[PDB]
Amino acid sequence: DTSSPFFCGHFAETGSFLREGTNVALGYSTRSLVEYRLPRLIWCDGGRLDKPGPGNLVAGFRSKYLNHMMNIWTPENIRSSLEGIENFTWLRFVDTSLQEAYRASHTDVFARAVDLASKQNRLGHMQIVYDEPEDKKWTPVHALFQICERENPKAVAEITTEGVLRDLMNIARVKYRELGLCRLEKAARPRASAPPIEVVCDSRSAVIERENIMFHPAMRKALFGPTPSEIKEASFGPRPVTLYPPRALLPAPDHDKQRFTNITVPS
Amino acid sequence: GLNLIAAHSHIRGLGVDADTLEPRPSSQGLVGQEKARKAAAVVLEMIKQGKIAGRAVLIAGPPSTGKTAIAMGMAQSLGQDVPFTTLAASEIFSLEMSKTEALTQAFRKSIGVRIKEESEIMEGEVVEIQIDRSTGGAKQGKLTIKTTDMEAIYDMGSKMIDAMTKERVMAGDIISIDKSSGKITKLGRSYARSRDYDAMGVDTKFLQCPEGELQKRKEVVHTVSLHEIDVINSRTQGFLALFSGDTGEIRSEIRDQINTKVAEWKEEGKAEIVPGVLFIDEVHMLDIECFSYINRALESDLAPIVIMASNRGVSRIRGTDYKSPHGLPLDFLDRVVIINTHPYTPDELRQILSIRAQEEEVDLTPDALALLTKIGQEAGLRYASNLITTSQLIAAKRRAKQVGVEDVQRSFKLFYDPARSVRFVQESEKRLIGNDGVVDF
Amino acid sequence: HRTAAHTHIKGLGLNSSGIAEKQAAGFVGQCAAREACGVVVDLIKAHKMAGRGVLLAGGPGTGKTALALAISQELGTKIPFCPITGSEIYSTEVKKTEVLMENFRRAIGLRVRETKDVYEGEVTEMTPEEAENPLGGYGKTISTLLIGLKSARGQKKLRLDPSIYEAIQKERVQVGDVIYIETNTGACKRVGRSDAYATEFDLEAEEYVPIPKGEVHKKKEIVQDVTLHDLDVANARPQGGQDIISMMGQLMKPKMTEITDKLRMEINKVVQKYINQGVAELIPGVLFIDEAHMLDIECFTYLNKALESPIAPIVVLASNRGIATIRGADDLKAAHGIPPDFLQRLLIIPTHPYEPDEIRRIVRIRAQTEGVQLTDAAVDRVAEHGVRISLRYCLQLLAPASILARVNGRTQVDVQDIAEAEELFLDARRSANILTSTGESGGLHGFIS
Amino acid sequence: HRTAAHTHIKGLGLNSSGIAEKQAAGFVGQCAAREACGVVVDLIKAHKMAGRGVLLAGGPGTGKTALALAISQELGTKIPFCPITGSEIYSTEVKKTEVLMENFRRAIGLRVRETKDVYEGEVTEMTPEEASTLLIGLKSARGQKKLRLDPSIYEAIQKERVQVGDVIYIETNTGACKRVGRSDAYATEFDLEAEEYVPIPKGEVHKKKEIVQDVTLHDLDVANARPQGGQDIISMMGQLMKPKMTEITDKLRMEINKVVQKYINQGVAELIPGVLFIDEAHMLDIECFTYLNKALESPIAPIVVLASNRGIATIRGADDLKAAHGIPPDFLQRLLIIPTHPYEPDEIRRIVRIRAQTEGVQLTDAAVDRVAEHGVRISLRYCLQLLAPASILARVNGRTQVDVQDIAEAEELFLDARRSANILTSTGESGGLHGFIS
Ligand SMILES: Nc1ncnc2c1ncn2[C@@H]1O[C@H](COP(=O)(O)OP(=O)(O)O)[C@@H](O)[C@H]1O
Ligand SMILES: Nc1ncnc2c1ncn2[C@@H]1O[C@H](COP(=O)(O)OP(=O)(O)O)[C@@H](O)[C@H]1O
C-alpha cells in the first residue's frame, strides 16, 4: 500500500486510458488553487518600479545612474580612491581585483556562491609547503590581509599521518551516522503540499517573467550540473576547458532512503 | 459548508432607509438602536461619496450594546466594492516588523485602485484535437471546436500545442483559451461524450455546451489596494509576502513613488481611487506611540475613514501612566467624533432574542420566550443568546419538538451567568487562588 | 502501558437521557459539571457552532482537565481536539495572535478524497534530448526526454519536461530502476533495482522489488484527513512542485511565519469549492486552552475577533483563579483573570470540591488502575491524608507504598508501608513548616531568604 | 480633488516685503508665525544651511502643521520635503539612530537632466554583422530606420524573446528594452498563437524628449550598499534573504559624498538641500536628541523643522528630568522656537467660511454663527467636522444649503469628547452589568 501527502494544487486529469496509447508527453501542469489576479497595467505596463517600459520612465535612468554611474563599486570610482587614507586603501591587499569586487557587489548571494564554487584554495596549502623557521611565514603581498585564510588548523590536520585531529573536526557526522538516523524510517511528514502562488495576469510578458523567475534556467544549470553534450564537447576537445557548473552543486541529502521528496513506499 | 451560525450571522445590512435616513425599527437584523444607526447611516453615506478625507468616528458604549453589530451592518451594506478592513488592535504588536509600520500597512490596505480592462476569451466544446507529433515534435496541429451555435477549426502555434498537451485537452472538454496569454481553464466536461471518459470517477459532474458566440470580449474590473502594490514592488517576486506575512520594513520611497504613480494614473483616466473603511476594533489596546501616528495618518489625501470602538470609561493609556476618557489621549480625542450607544429596553431584548432564535431555526413557546427575556434583563444578551443554543440541544436530549420552561430552567441551572460566577468566586475565596493561598478542605 | 495521571478516565459516563450517574466510567460524583460537559459534547457533534465560549472554573485539584480528557475521549478519534496552555503561545518568531490563529485552524478538520495519477514503471531507455542554446552564459540545457516505462502488461514510451527531468535527476534514476512518476506535483521516488537485474554478488544494499503488475498508467483514489492549518502552511511555505521556490524552500531552515488574513480567506474559498464539488467534508473541533489566566489582555482582545468569524471552533477555557489581576494591564482586577468584557461570551461551568467518601472512591479507582491492591484500613488511611492534606497528594502515596511493600515481601499494602512512606516522602505544607521552623536565621545551616 | 484636513492651505500668503497679511492664501490671522516661516523658507532657498533646527510651540488645535504644509507648498515640487512623525523612528531591524540618518539622506535632493532617445517600433531584421554588432531595422508607421547595437545591449535583447517581428522599445541612453508585443501584420500567421497583438505605432521611430528627475541620497546609499531590484533574484525566498534594512556605516556615506561631489564638479547633476519635518517631537527620546546634536553639525545636514505641543513634560527614556516641550535643554538651545498662539472668536468664522467653500458646502449666515459658537465653546477641530456631515443631512431632506436645523441635528447625532466624558462619568455611574468598565 503506497501513499503520499495530500496535494492542494490544480493538476490536469487524464481523460481516458484507451486514447493516449504509447507515445505520450507529460506536461508540468501543477498550479495553485490559490490565485492572485492582477491587471496588465500593474503587473506588466507601469505598475512595477523595475520594468523600464513607457509610463515607467524613471526605471531606466534610475537603473543606470544608480548601478553604473554614481556607484562606489565601479572600477573607475575605485581607481581614484586607492592611494592612502582613502576608502579603498585595503583593496590591494585582499586577494581580489577590481573586476572581482565589481562582480561581487552586483550578483546575488547565489551567483556569488557559484563563483566561489570554481576557486581553488591555495592559502591553506601555504601552511603545508612553506612551513620552515627560515621561511619566516611567507604570504603573498596581494593576499596579505587574509590572515584567517592562512593560519588554519584544518589544512594542517588534513595532511597528518594519524587522523587524531580529523577524528575531532567532523565528529558530528560520525555520531550522526553511527546512531542510525539515516536508515531510520521517516516517521513524520507534512500533511499537505502546494506549489507557490502565481499571478494570473493575461499578457505574454507575465508568462515570460514567470518562466524566467520561478524557473530561471541559469540557477537550474548551476544547481543540477552540465549537459552530457557539454561533457562530450569538454572531454573530447584538444585543450582543457572549464564548465559553468564545475560539478553538480546539489547538496548531498542527509537521509538515504527518502531524499528531497515526501513520497512513502511500504516495506 | 463554512457558513456556520456565528454571533453576527443574522445582520444583512444596516437596515436603515436610504431616502430620508430614517432608522426603521426592525429591518435586516439591526433592531432597536435608533440614534446610533442614523449617525452610522450618515457616516456610511459620506463614505460612498468619496469627497472627504480619512476621518475618525468612535463608536463608544457599554459592553454588549451593539457596536460590532453596527460595524458588521456597515460591512454588509457596501458589498465587495469599497474595501472594508477589520483590525483587532493586537495584530499590530508583531515581531516580523515594527509597530508603526504595521499600522501604516493597515492604512494602505484600505485605499483601492479600480481599473477595468478587456480580455478576449473562447468558450466551447472541443470536437477533436490532432497534433502532428510524428521523430517529430510540437510543430503543427488542428483544433476543431464548437458551441451550440458556432463551429470552427484553428491551427496552433508551437507555444499553444505545448499548452494543449500541458492541460491534456481531450475530445469533449469545455475549455477557455484566453487568447492574450494562452492559459486553459477546463470549465468542465460535456455530457454528450459521457461514454468517452474512462479514467474518471463513477460520480462525475457533466456540463452542457456553452451558448452564444465562440469569441467574445470580457470587461473584467479589478480593484487592488496600495498595500498590494507596495508589497509587489518590494522584492524580486514579492507578492508571496502578502500571502505569508514575510514582508519587512518597506522603505518609504517605494510608497512615495506609488503615491505619485496612482495620481498620474488618475489624471490620465486610466484608474480610479476608491477610499475604503478601516475598523479598528478595541482601539483602547493601543499605546500612545500608536496615537501619535494615527493623528498624522488621518491628514493626507489618501487615507481611509477609520471607525473604531471603545468600551472603557476613565482608564489608563498604555505606555503611559495617566488616565483619560475612553482610554484615548485628549489630543487624539480632538480628532475623533463620538457616537454613544444605550442599553436595551426589554421588548427590544425580546425581539433580538426572537431574531437570534429564528436565525438558528429553534422553535420557542411564548412562555419560554418571556422567561428568556426575564433572564436577559438580568444577565445580558450573550448569556440568553447562548441559552437558546443550549436549550434546543437539551430539548433534543429527551426527544422534544419545541423548547419550553423545563429546558430554559435547565440551561440556566447548569451554565452560570457571570453575575453568579462572581458570587461563586466571592463565596469560594479560600480554595480559588486569589494571589497567595491554597487551602485543601 | 504507562499509567499517567489521567488513565482511569474513559469518558463522562452519561445515561441515555443525559443524566450523569455518579461513579461510572472513571469519575466519582461531579454531577453538575459532567452534565454540562455532555451538553458541550453534543454541541460539538451537531455543527451549529461557529465559536462558543465554555469556561471551566473551580479550584486546583478538582478535576478541570479530567473533564477535558473525558470530552476528548467522548468526541472520538475523527474529530479534531487541540489542547494547549496559556504559556505556549509566547513565541519568538511570530506575534502571539498568529499562534492563536494557528491553534484555531488546527482545531478545524477536513476529510478530502484525492485521485493520484501514478506512472509506475521500470525504466528501459533513458536518453536526454537537448534543445538550441545560444550565447547566454549558462550554456546547454536539457529540454526533452524519451523515458520508457515497462510495467508487467503493456509498456509505454513517454516524453518529459525539463522540470520532471530534474525531479528524476535529483533521485539518481539509472537504467533498471523502478519508479512511479507522481503527476500531481511532479515528484518521482525511486524504489529499487528491478529483479531482472538481480544478483546476490552485490554491495550497494539495494532493495530488489519485482516489476509492478497492472497498467503502467494507474489511477488511485485515497482519503486524507487535513486540517485548515495544514493548508495554510502548505500555501505559505511551498514544498511541492519542481520549480526553484519550492526546491530552495526546503533546503532552508523552517520558520513559523505570519500567515495573513488574505491567505486564511482564500483557503476558505478553496475549501468551499471542494465542498461544492461533493468531495470534502468539514468537521469542526475543540480548542482546549488550559490555564487561560496566563493569557494577557492582548490575547483576550483578539479572541473577540477570532470568535466573530463565520468558521471558528469551540473554545474550552480552564482557569483556577479567584479574584486576580490580569497579566496585561495590572490595574484592573477581575474574576478568574478573564477580563470583564470577554467574560460575557463564556458559558461558565463551575466545579465543586470533594467529600470524604468521594476521595475514598477515587483512591480505590486509582489503586485498581495502577495495579496496587491493598487493605481497607490502608484505604481509610490514604483517605484521611486526602481529607487533611490534599487530593492529588494522597494519590501519590500509592507508588512508593507498593515498592516498599515489595521490599518487605508483601503483595498487598498494609498500614505500615503507608506509615513509612508518609515519613520518607513529604507534602508541601509540612515542608513549609519545617522550612519556617528550622530556617530561623540565615547563615551556614540556614536557607537563602 | 478630494478634501483633506489641509486642502485650503495653498501658501503662506506673504507680501513682497515679507510681511504677512490677514486672510491670505487659506490662513486666517496667525501673523508672526507665518512671517517666521517665510523667513525659514527664504533660508532654505538661500543655500547657506548645513543643519538648522526650528521648533514650533503652541498647543493642540492651533496651526502648527498647517505652517509645515504651507512651507511644503511654498518650496514647490523641486526641493525635497520629508515629513515623518517621531514614532516612525522605532524599528525591529535597525537601531533608532540610523533611521534618523536615513531621513537626513532622504531629505537631500540631487537633480539630473536627461535626454532619453526612445525607439518604438517593429523589428525588420536581426542581422549579426561581425564575427558582435547586430543591426536592427525598426519599422514604424512613418518609416524604418537602421540601428547599430553594442554587443552588450544585444545580450539584453536576446534574454528577452525577440525573434522576427516583435515591436520593441529600445532606450538609446540607458539601454533599457521592453518587448511590447507581436505586430498585427504577423497576427494571422497561425490561427491560435498566444501573443499580445498590438498595432504598429503611428508616430516617429526616434522620439527625443528631455526629463528632469530627482534622486535622494538615501537611494544612492541603498543602491550602493546592497544589490536592488534588477539582479536580486534570491530575494524570492524571503526569510533571511529579503532586503532587510542594514546598518549603513559612516564610511559608505563618506565615499558617496565623494562620488556625488565628483559628478557635481563635472556639471552633470545639481544639488538641492531639503527639509526634514519631524512632527510630534516628544516621541523622540533622549537616545535621539543626543544623536541629533551630533548629526546636525555635519556640513551636509538639512534643515529640521521640529513640532511639539507639550508643556513641561517628562523626557522619554530618562524619567528623572522635566523639560519644556519634551525637548532636553542640551538640545533646546540649538532650536529657533516660533510661537503659535490660539484663535480669537472673530478669527474662527473666517476659518469656517474657508473650510465651507473648500468642501463646496454652502450655508447661510445664521449657521456660520452656530458653527463659530461650537468653535469657541468646545474646540476648533470639532466645529470643522460638522460642515461635512450636516451637508449629508441637507441634500437628503430636500435642501441644498445648510440651515440651523441640520447643525442642531448634527450636534446630537455626533457628540464631541467633552459631552461624551460627561455621559461617561455622570450617566455611567455604577459599574455593573450595563456600565462602563474602567
Ligand atoms: N441592534 C441589534 N440587532 C440585533 N442584534 C443585536 C443588536 N445589537 C446587539 N445585538 C446582538 O448583541 C450581541 C452583542 O453585540 P456586540 O456589538 O458584539 O457587543 P459589543 O458592542 O460589546 O461588542 C451581538 O451578538 C449581536 O448579535
Ligand atoms: N471526578 C474525579 N474522578 C477521579 N479522579 C479525579 C476526579 N477529579 C479529579 N481527579 C483527579 O485529580 C487529579 C488532578 O486533577 P486535575 O484536573 O489535574 O486538577 P486541576 O483541575 O487543578 O487541573 C487527577 O489525577 C485526577 O485523577
Ligand SMILES: Nc1ncnc2c1ncn2[C@@H]1O[C@H](COP(=O)(O)OP(=O)(O)O)[C@@H](O)[C@H]1O
Ligand atoms: N490659520 C489657519 N487658517 C485656517 N485653518 C487653520 C489655521 N490654523 C489651523 N487651522 C486648522 O487647524 C487644523 C490643523 O491643526 P494642527 O495644526 O494639525 O494641530 P496640531 O499641529 O496641534 O496637530 C486644520 O484642520 C486647519 O483647518
